[PDB]
Amino acid sequence: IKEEHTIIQAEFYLLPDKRGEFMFDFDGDEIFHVDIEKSETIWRLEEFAKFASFEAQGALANIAVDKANLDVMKERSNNTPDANVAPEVTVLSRSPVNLGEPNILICFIDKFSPPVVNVTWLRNGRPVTEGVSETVFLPRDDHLFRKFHYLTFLPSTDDFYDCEVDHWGLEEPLRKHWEFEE
Amino acid sequence: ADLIAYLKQATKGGGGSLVPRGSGGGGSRPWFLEYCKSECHFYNGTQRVRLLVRYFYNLEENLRFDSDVGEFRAVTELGRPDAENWNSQPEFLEQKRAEVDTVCRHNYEIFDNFLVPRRVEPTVTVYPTKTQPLEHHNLLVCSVSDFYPGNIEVRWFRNGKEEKTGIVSTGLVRNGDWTFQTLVMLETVPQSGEVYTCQVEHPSLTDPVTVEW
Ligand SMILES: *[C@@H]1O[C@H](CO)[C@@H](O[C@H]2O[C@H](CO)[C@@H](O)[C@H](O)[C@H]2NC(C)=O)[C@H](O)[C@H]1NC(C)=O
Ligand SMILES: *[C@@H]1O[C@H](CO)[C@@H](O)[C@H](O)[C@H]1NC(C)=O
Ligand SMILES: *[C@@H]1O[C@H](CO)[C@@H](O)[C@H](O)[C@H]1NC(C)=O
- Which CATH number fits the domain that encloses residue B132? 2.60.40.10
Do residue B14 and residue A72 have CB atoms under 8 angstroms apart? yes
Ligand nearest to the CA of B47: 1
- SS3 of chain B: the string is CCECCCCCCCCCCCCCCCCCCCCCCCCCCCCEEEEEEEEEEECECECCEEEEEEEEECCEEEEEEECCCCCEEECCHHHHHHHHHHHCCHHHHHHHHHHHHHHHHHHHHHHCCCCCCCCECCEEEEEECCCCCCCCCCEEEEEEEEEECCCCEEEEEECCEECCCCEEECCCEECCCCCEEEEEEEECCCCCCCCEEEEEECCCCCCCEEEEC
Q: Report the domain count for chain B.
A: 2
Domain end, chosen from B65, B89, B116, is at: B116
A58 and A90, same structural domain? Answer: no
B97 and B3, same structural domain? Answer: yes
Cβ contacts of residue A13 below 8 Å, gap of 6+?
A19, A20, A21, A63, A66, A67, A69, A70, B33, B34
Q: What is the resolution of this structure in A?
A: 2.8
A88 and A72, same structural domain? Answer: no
The rounded Cα A38 to chain-centroid distance in angstroms is 18
Do residue B114 and residue A82 have CB atoms under 8 angstroms apart? no
Domain end, chosen from A81, A109, A141, is at: A81
B152 and B122, same structural domain? Answer: yes
The rounded Cα B117 to chain-centroid distance in angstroms is 17
Of B125, B186, B130, give the one whose Cα is nearest residue B158.
B186
Encoded amino acid at B72, one letter: F
List, comma-separated, the residues after which chain A is broken, a break being a C to N distance over 2.5 A; otherwise answer none.
Answer: none
**Could you tell me the distance, in angstroms and rounded to a whole number, from the CA of residue A5 to the centre of ligand 1?**
15
How far apart are alpha carbons B31 and B66 in whole angstroms?
28
**Chain A contacts of B43, Cβ < 8 Å?**
4
B100 and B8, same structural domain? Answer: yes
CATH number at residue A73: 3.10.320.10
B191 and B103, same structural domain? Answer: no
**Could you tell me the distance, in angstroms and rounded to a whole number, from the CA of residue B146 to the centre of ligand 1?**
29
A51 and A8, same structural domain? Answer: yes
CATH number at residue A156: 2.60.40.10
B161 and B96, same structural domain? Answer: no
| In contact, A119 and B37? CB cutoff 8 Å | no
B96 and B150, same structural domain? Answer: no
How far apart are alpha carbons B7 and B9 in whole angstroms?
6
A30 and A20, same structural domain? Answer: yes
B109 and B17, same structural domain? Answer: yes
B8 and B106, same structural domain? Answer: yes
How far apart are alpha carbons B150 and B179 in whole angstroms?
8
B141 and B96, same structural domain? Answer: no
Method of elucidation = X-ray
Q: Report the domain count for chain A.
A: 2
Establish whether the linkage from the previous residue to B81 is cis, with ω within 30° of 0.
no
Give the structural domain span for A119.
82-181
A106 and A32, same structural domain? Answer: no
CATH number at residue B75: 3.10.320.10
| In contact, B195 and B212? CB cutoff 8 Å | yes
How far apart are alpha carbons B39 and B42 in whole angstroms?
10
A158 and A146, same structural domain? Answer: yes
Domain end, chosen from B93, B116, B139, is at: B116
**Chain A contacts of B18, Cβ < 8 Å?**
76-78
| In contact, B108 and B40? CB cutoff 8 Å | yes
Nearest to B17 among A29, A68, A78 (CB): A78
**Could you tell me the distance, in angstroms and rounded to a whole number, from the CA of residue B46 to the centre of ligand 1?**
11
Domain end, chosen from B69, B98, B116, is at: B116
Scanning A108-127 for CB atoms below 8 A from B yields: 108, 113-115
Backbone angles phi, psi at B117, to 5 degrees: -75, -10
How far apart are alpha carbons A91 and A93 in whole angstroms?
7
A75 and A86, same structural domain? Answer: no
A165 and A88, same structural domain? Answer: yes
Give the structural domain span for B76.
1-116
Largest interatomic CA distance in chain B: 78
